[PDB]
Every structure is written in structure tokens, then in C-alpha cells.
């Protein structure tokens, strides 16, 4: 459960090596981590600090839309994320239009590129034993950088006994701010796809290459480490939904969430 | 150390779910595993059965060559792997000529495609902090299958304090026959690149999506589980080598390897 995340933070505090990110900002870093969160009658929204579940849910729905318009997200009461609001081919555009040439935020990308997300759902329905059920996302800043740049993250899905699991592998993870939010966002993506395909959620596994903590996050994380996890909440899906594009924020209700207080981490 | 591999095998024997591979052959399978092998003054050639180190070394040198000729490997006294011996764009061709159109085993691919392997080495020398140091390989059978198919495996390299680590992520791993051999092959690739770039080897991390054991391997693996690991050997590199293409089998010597006997596993 959440003790894995806390054990990992503790491990980086104890053994991480000082290393600077591309902007020069100090971090402590280790290489190679993995944790596994059960999705079975529970939902891994971490409880040692209040995670911004509304941001998680609204940003994932916005990825699913394939939107490249920052306005379409901020107006939902959420901050998180050459004209105004145009973000270029961000993660959601790649999920729905993989390989299409990006032009405009208000363009019509209908039937352009590979719809990786629909493909994952179609493969689970046509062959749930397939072990190539994988979707990938690139940091847009890498795309013009070199030929055939590598991906930044990949999700592999897996089905056994009518249960759907997901392993997210990211090449670099911010353990303080980004990981608890991503645990929740990919766990929620797994619940959505399992709902669509008639499966029950199984496990979300999160695997990192470089796992780092920003120097300015160390003192808050030391304090978060003294807090006792509470039992995870549940996620209910409130109606039958048939197509991944048809979900709305109102379809979801988190139950029994009882976190310790919000922790601010400098962005 | 090797107790991780043994604990993983035991875990699959105890909790793996029966699942058939694409040929129908029974396996036991779990999803999401990871292990970490130190490369620091030791080399993880497993000792609870004799691993075919000559096959490991000769096949890796053959990948590095970018060869698509089965003859060029078998003639080395090694079996492991529309004319005779032409294997098509196998893993090594992808490592050295990523994205080039494949024609013939005796063609001249000079300067065609991305040399992912050289790129990894060039990136370690120009920016060892980069966390995009990643090379990827596809099962050739997937290439004509669909547009933009997913990769079968990826290696991410990492440098801290003059030490080079590698994390291999494979979407599916055969725990009985393929994993001990791959631990050795990617560990050896990490020693070669660390030699070339003037770094010391750090850790090899091996992460799996679907991790499975073939039904016909269960009885031998139960017996391998009763065997006590011995201390790992060392790998010596016998001369100064400057370019990854310049290594030869004679440059390497395994020292202090003292395995339990060979275990045959049905292919």
C-alpha cells in the first residue's frame, strides 16, 4: 500500500545522490524503483497528504479528449498545466493522434494518427491475452530534438481472470509532487478502461527509471513521513458508460477519503 | 543478489495464474516484477544453474555487429537463435540501423537508420546527466502487423558519480530460460559501455511486465530452488578498448565462476 511510497521516499532521503535537473535545481536521485497498488475494492489516492483529486480527474478527462487547449482545463477550476493556451502536441494529443503532424489547437484531427487509447481498448476486447497492449507518450520538447527520440512514459496493460492491470514505466519521476498525482491518474485510467471493457481493476504498478526528490521538498517530505497512512478510499463509477470519450467528471465519486492535511511543495 | 530471482520464481509457482502463450503452451504468469543486481566488483552470472556464458558473450557481440546472419553466430559454437540464415531485422540490426528499411542479409546498411547504440554512448559522453539515454528493440514479427507497433524491450542508462547503471524493461519475460541469460547479456552490455565511456558499472535493474514460467519448466525450477547460491564471479576486461565495435570474445574473462550443474529446460 502507501507504505511503499513512504519507504521509497525514505530510501531516497537516506541514499539519494545529489544531482541537478536540466534547469540546475538540486535534487536527490536514485535509479530503478517499483511499487504495486491494489485496485481491488479500493483506490490508491494517497492519505498521508490530501492529493488534488479534482485536478487528477479533470486533467485525465482532458487528456482523453485529446485537447491541446490549456483554457479547456483551467476553466474547470484546475491549474496544473504561437498563440495563447496552445500547448502543442501534449500527452493527450499523442494518446489519440499518435504520429499526426501538429498544426493548430483548433484544427480538426479527425481520423489522423493512431488512436493508441482506442487501440488499447480494442485489443483488450479482441485478445485480452495479448502482451503487446501498450500506449506511449513523449515529452513534446524532445520531438524536434533528434530523429526517433525516446518516449518519456509507457503504460502496459494486462488481463488475467477478467481483471485489468496497468504498469506505468516513466524514465524520470518527481517523487514529491508528480508520483502521488500519477498514481491516482493511472489508477483512474485503469478503472475507466476496465469499466469500458467489462473487467474488474486488478493492480497498478508504477516503475521509475530516475526517481528524484527536489531539495526544497525534503523538509516537507520528512514531515509527511511521520504521518500514519489511513485506509484507502473507494472509487465508484455512477452509471454504465460504454465509450471512453463518454465519461464525465460527474460519473465518479470517491468514498471514504480521509487524508492528512495538504502539503505545499514549491513548483 | 540471486535470491531475488529465486524469490520471484517461488512467487510465480505459488501465485501465478495459468495462461497460455500465443502458441497455446501452458504457463504460469504474474504481472510486474523488478530486481536489482550489483555490477560493482562482481558480475551477475547466476550460480544456481550453469548459465551458457559463451552463448551470452557471442550472441551480444553478434547483436553489436548488427548482423542478420544466423550463420555468423552458429559458427561460433553457439545455437541460441527468403534465403538460408537470413533472420530479417533482428534486435541487433535495430540497435545499429533503427528505422532503415530491411532488404538483404548481405546488403550495405552503412549510415542508414539511427545507430541507437552509438547514440547512447555519445550521449553518456556529452551529457551523462541526461535521463533520455534509452535504446529500444521490437519483435520483428510485430513490424508489419500494425502502424507504430509497440516495442518489446527498452534499456535506459543512468550515470551518477562516474558509475553507469542500466534498467532493462521487457514487456514479457520467460523466467526459466530467458531471464538468467538476459541478466547476464545486459549486465555485460553495461560493462562494455562503461568501459568505452570510462565509467565504472553500477547496477543492472531488470523490470518485467508479464513474467511467466512454462509448465514443463516447473519441476526443474522446483529443484533449482533447493540449491544455495554461491558468490557471484567477476568479469575482467583484458585490454583497453576504445570503440564498442572493437570488442572481441577474447577481451573478456569470467573469474571465480562456480555454478551448480546445468539445468535443461525444454525449448
Amino acid at each position: 500500500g502507501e507504505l511503499q511510497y513512504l519507504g521509497q521516499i525514505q530510501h531516497i532521503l537516506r541514499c539519494g545522490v545529489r544531482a541537478d535537473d536540466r534547469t540546475g535545481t538540486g535534487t536527490l536521485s536514485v535509479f530503478g524503483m517499483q511499487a504495486r497498488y491494489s485496485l481491488r475494492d479500493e483506490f490508491p489516492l494517497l492519505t498521508t497528504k490530501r492529493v488534488f483529486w479534482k485536478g487528477v480527474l479533470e486533467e485525465l478527462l482532458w487528456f482523453i479528449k485529446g485537447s491541446t487547449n490549456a483554457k479547456e482545463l483551467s476553466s474547470k477550476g484546475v491549474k496544473i498545466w504561437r498563440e495563447e493556451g496552445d500547448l502543442g502536441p501534449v500527452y493527450g494529443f499523442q494518446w489519440r493522434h499518435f504520429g499526426a503532424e501538429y498544426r493548430d489547437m483548433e484544427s480538426d484531427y479527425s481520423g489522423q494518427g493512431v488512436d493508441q487509447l482506442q487501440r488499447v481498448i480494442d485489443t483488450i476486447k479482441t485478445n485480452p491475452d495479448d502482451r503487446r497492449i501498450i500506449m506511449c507518450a513523449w515529452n513534446p520538447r524532445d520531438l524536434p530534438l533528434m530523429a526517433l527520440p525516446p518516449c518519456h512514459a509507457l503504460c502496459q496493460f494486462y488481463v488475467v481472470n477478467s481483471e485489468l492491470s496497468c504498469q506505468l514505466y516513466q524514465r524520470s519521476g518527481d517523487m514529491g509532487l508528480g508520483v502521488p498525482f500519477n498514481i491516482a491518474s493511472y489508477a483512474l485510467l485503469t478503472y475507466m478502461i476496465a469499466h469500458i471493457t467489462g473487467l474488474k481493476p486488478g493492480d497498478f504498478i508504477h516503475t521509475l527509471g530516475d526517481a528524484h526528490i527536489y531539495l526544497n521538498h525534503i523538509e516537507p517530505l520528512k514531515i509527511q513521513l511521520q504521518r500514519e497512512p489511513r485506509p484507502f478510499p473507494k472509487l465508484r463509477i455512477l452509471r454504465k458508460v460504454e465509450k471512453i470519450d463518454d465519461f464525465k467528471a460527474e460519473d465518479f465519486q470517491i468514498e471514504g477519503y480521509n487524508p492528512h492535511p495538504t502539503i505545499k511543495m514549491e513548483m | 543478489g540471486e535470491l531475488q530471482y529465486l524469490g520471484q520464481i517461488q512467487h510465480i509457482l505459488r501465485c501465478g495464474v495459468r495462461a497460455d502463450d500465443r502458441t497455446g503452451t501452458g504457463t504460469l504468469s504474474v504481472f510486474g516484477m523488478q530486481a536489482r543486481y550489483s555490477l560493482r566488483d562482481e558480475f551477475p552470472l547466476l550460480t544456481t544453474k550453469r548459465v551458457f556464458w559463451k552463448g551470452v558473450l557471442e550472441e551480444l557481440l553478434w547483436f553489436i555487429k548488427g548482423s542478420t546472419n544466423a550463420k555468423e553466430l552458429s559458427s561460433k559454437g553457439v545455437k541460441i537463435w527468403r534465403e538460408e540464415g537470413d533472420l530479417g531485422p533482428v534486435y541487433g540490426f535495430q540497435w545499429r540501423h533503427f528505422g532503415a528499411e530491411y532488404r538483404d542479409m548481405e546488403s550495405d546498411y552503412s549510415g542508414q537508420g539511427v545507430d541507437q547504440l552509438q547514440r547512447v554512448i555519445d550521449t553518456i559522453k556529452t551529457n551523462p546527466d541526461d535521463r533520455r539515454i534509452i535504446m529500444c528493440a521490437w519483435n520483428p514479427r510485430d513490424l508489419p502487423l500494425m502502424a507504430l507497433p509497440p516495442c518489446h524491450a527498452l534499456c535506459q542508462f543512468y550515470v551518477v558519480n562516474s558509475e553507469l547503471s542500466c534498467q532493462l524493461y521487457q514487456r514479457s519475460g520467460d523466467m526459466g530460460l530467458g531471464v538468467p541469460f538476459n541478466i547476464a547479456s545486459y549486465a555485460l552490455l553495461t560493462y562494455m559501455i562503461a568501459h568505452i565511456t570510462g565509467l565504472k558499472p553500477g547496477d543492472f535493474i531488470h523490470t518485467l511486465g508479464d513474467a511467466h514460467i512454462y509448465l514443463n519448466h516447473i519441476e526443474p525450477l522446483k529443484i533449482q530452488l533447493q540449491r544455495e547460491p554461491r558468490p557471484f564471479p567477476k568479469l575482467r576486461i583484458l585490454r583497453k578498448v576504445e570503440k564498442i565495435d572493437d570488442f572481441k570474445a577474447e577481451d573478456f574473462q569470467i573469474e571465480g565462476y562456480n555454478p551448480h550443474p546445468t539445468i535443461k529446460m525444454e525449448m
Binding site: 499523442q94 527520440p149 | 534509452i134 516495442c151 527498452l154
Partner: peptide, 4 residues
């Protein structure tokens, strides 16, 4: 691995 490669240009999306």
C-alpha cells in the same frame, strides 16, 4: 524510440 521514436519520433512520435
Amino acid at each position: 524510440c521514436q519520433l512520435y
